[PDB]
């Protein structure tokens, strides 16, 4: 007989390694042989050897969400003791590669890479300073790479976190930030036109903007074009110095820092 190691403790778990510690045996030993095997039939077995005074061991190179059984053996040149057994399940690995597609004024479609570990459901949460925290339902199952966030507030920097769930465990979140689109100004109405000037007004969008960009360009004819930069609180414009009897196109762009809304467009002809 060789007195077995006693009271095995698991000090750390993660998606590819298990850390265990044990109490030294009573018999004088040359070392300890630790082994890791999946609790089911198949799989790969990892075997490491600890020193005679080593009571801890980390086993790397494992697979995520696998029920491993760790056996410790007290060793001599003559033989081996009986194994102290202790089971442990590896954690689920982190999803990576968050992609943002079809970013609209109201919707953001996200895509990611499925982790190698078997995932039951996902938990997609998204948030922004303007509309708080939301959790998506129904939670995407493990056999899905896509997710569509709907009903978002325009002109908002949204943060999206995706975490994989398997039974009791949670992965590390994969986080990615993405801003929604700014809607175009509405109800572009021309108020007064002259042979050399026009006046237009609009209903401003429901976003805190940094300014506007209005560009006036002739249609069906070649000539000068004008572009004015306006304050964010503006809702109308007067463009002067235009040509006589001239079909002009007026585009109103809403600007919030680095993002540009679609143009609120309208066509009008100057006076003959």
Classify the C-alpha dihedral 5-10-12-14 as positive or negative.
positive
Residues 205 and 231 in one domain: yes
Indicate whether 83 belongs to any domain.
Answer: yes
Return the residue matching tokens 């968050």.
98
Residues 20 and 79 in one domain: yes
Q: d(Cα 176, Cα 123) in Å, to the nearest integer?
A: 14
Q: d(Cα 250, Cα 140) in Å, to the nearest integer?
A: 45
Q: What is the DSSP string of 128-152?
A: ETTTEEEE-SSPPBSS--EEEE-SP
Q: d(Cα 43, Cα 177) in Å, to the nearest integer?
A: 39
Residues 150 and 209 in one domain: no
Query: Which residue from 46, 44, 43, 33 is spatially nearest to 5, judged by alpha carbons?
Result: 33
Helix, strand, coil share of the chain (percent; to 5): 0, 55, 45
Residues 79 and 104 in one domain: no
- The maximal CA–CA distance of the chain, rounded, in angstroms, is 112
- Structural domain total, the chain: 3
Question: How far apart are the two ends of the chain, measured CA to CA in Å?
Answer: 112
Contact 225, 215 (CB under 8 A): yes
Q: d(Cα 5, Cα 27) in Å, to the nearest integer?
A: 10
Query: Which residue from 69, 60, 71, 72 is spatially nearest to 15, judged by alpha carbons?
Result: 60
Structure solved using which method? X-ray
Query: What's the CA angle centered on 29, arms 62 and 79, to 5 degrees?
Result: 80
Return the residue matching tokens 């609180």.
233
Residues 63 and 41 in one domain: yes
Indicate whether 28 belongs to any domain.
Answer: yes
Q: d(Cα 164, Cα 184) in Å, to the nearest integer?
A: 37
Residues 86 and 100 in one domain: no
Contact 199, 193 (CB under 8 A): yes
Residues 197 and 167 in one domain: no
Residues 194 and 242 in one domain: yes
Which of 179, 207, 228 is the last residue before a domain boundary? Answer: 179
CA dihedral (74, 80, 82, 87) in degrees, to 10, reads 60
Residues 85 and 10 in one domain: yes
Indicate whether 241 belongs to any domain.
Answer: yes
Residues 123 and 78 in one domain: no
Indicate whether 1 belongs to any domain.
Answer: no
What is the domain-level CATH number for residue 239?
A: 2.60.40.10
Q: d(Cα 47, Cα 73) in Å, to the nearest integer?
A: 11
> Using H for helix, E for strand and C for coil, what is the string for 17-75?
CEEEEEECCCCCCCEEEEEEEECCCCCCCEEEEECCCCCEEEECCCCCCCEEEEEEEEE
Residue 35's contacts (CB-CB under 8 Å, 6 or more residues apart) are 45, 46, 47, 70, 71, 73, 83
Residues 156 and 227 in one domain: no
Q: d(Cα 116, Cα 94) in Å, to the nearest integer?
A: 9
Indicate whether 156 belongs to any domain.
Answer: yes
What is the 8-class DSSP label of residue 197? -
Query: What's the CA angle centered on 108, arms 107 and 109, to 5 degrees?
Result: 120
Residue numbers of the domain that contains 139: 96-179
Residues 190 and 237 in one domain: yes
CB count in 10 Å sphere of residue 39: 12
Compute φ and ψ for 76, nearest 5 degrees. Answer: -135, 175
Resolution (Å) of this entry? 2.4
**Could you tell me whether strands 174-179 and 211-218 are parallel, antiparallel, or unpaired per DSSP bridges?**
unpaired
Which of 112, 145, 179 is the last residue before a domain boundary? Answer: 179
Which of 152, 179, 206 is the last residue before a domain boundary? Answer: 179
């Amino acid at each position: 007989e060789i007195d077995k190691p006693s009271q095995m403790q698991v000090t750390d778990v993660q998606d590819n390694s298990i850390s265990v510690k044990w109490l030294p045996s009573s018999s004088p030993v040359t070392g300890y042989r630790v082994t890791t095997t999946p609790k089911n039939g198949p799989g790969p077995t990892k075997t490491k050897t600890a020193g005679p005074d080593q009571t801890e061991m980390t086993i790397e190179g494992l697979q995520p969400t696998v029920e491993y059984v760790v056996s410790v053996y007290a060793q001599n040149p003559s033989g081996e003791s009986q194994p102290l057994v202790q089971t442990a399940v590896t954690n689920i690995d982190r999803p990576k590669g968050l992609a943002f597609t079809d970013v609209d004024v109201d919707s953001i479609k996200i895509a990611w890479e499925s982790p190698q570990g078997q995932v039951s459901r996902y938990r997609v949460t998204y948030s922004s300073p303007e509309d708080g925290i939301h959790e998506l339902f129904p939670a995407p199952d493990g056999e899905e790479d896509t997710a569509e966030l709907q009903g978002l507030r325009p002109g908002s920097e949204y943060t999206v976190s995706v975490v994989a769930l398997h039974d009791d465990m949670e992965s590390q979140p994969l986080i990615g930030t993405q801003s929604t689109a700014i809607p175009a100004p509405t109800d572009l109405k021309f108020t007064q036109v002259t042979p050399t000037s026009l006046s237009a007004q609009w209903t401003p969008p429901n976003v805190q903007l940094t300014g506007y960009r209005v560009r006036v360009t002739p249609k069906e004819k070649t000539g000068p074009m004008k572009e004015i930069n306006l304050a964010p609180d503006s809702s109308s414009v007067v463009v002067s110095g235009l040509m006589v009897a001239t079909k002009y196109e007026v585009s109103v762009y809403a600007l919030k820092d680095t993002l540009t809304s679609r143009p609120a467009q309208g066509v009008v002809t100057t006076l003959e």
